Structure formats: C-alpha cells, structure tokens
Ligand binder design. Sequence first.
Ligand SMILES: [Zn+2]
Ligand SMILES: [Zn+2]
Length: 72
Amino acid sequence: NGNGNVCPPGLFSNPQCCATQVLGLIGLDCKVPSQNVYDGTDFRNVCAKTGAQPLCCVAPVAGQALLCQTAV
Ligand SMILES: [Zn+2]
Ligand SMILES: [Zn+2]
C-alpha cells in the first residue's frame, strides 16, 4: 500500500498511517496503509479512516513510535 508515490526517496521512504506524530519527527501508532496510495489525497484520506495521520517513516514495519516526517 503505497511505497513512495506519497513519500520522498531515501530515509523517510515508507508510508505509515499513524495515530499522531510528535516533535515533528516521531510518528506514533503507525500502521502500514490498507490501500495502495498514489497521492496525498488518498494518503490523507485512506489514513483518516483510522482517525490516523499520513506520514513517511524510515521503516515499513508498524511501530509504536517511528522516526517520521509528515506526508506532503
Ligand atoms: Zn492503535
Ligand atoms: Zn488520489
């Protein structure tokens, strides 16, 4: 479900739907999407479902807290 059609090349390459985010770089309760996203619109909207926040983290694995960045 997405992989970088919504995220930057590199380190914040991985799209996760997250609970919230803190400090501008830590994403929390991050689950990987439930649907391939192609843009921000489907990123923000596919995430919203869970009441979550679209982010681009350094890992593709779900995690309590991950070093993320907010999706564009
Ligand atoms: Zn949760
Ligand atoms: Zn779209």
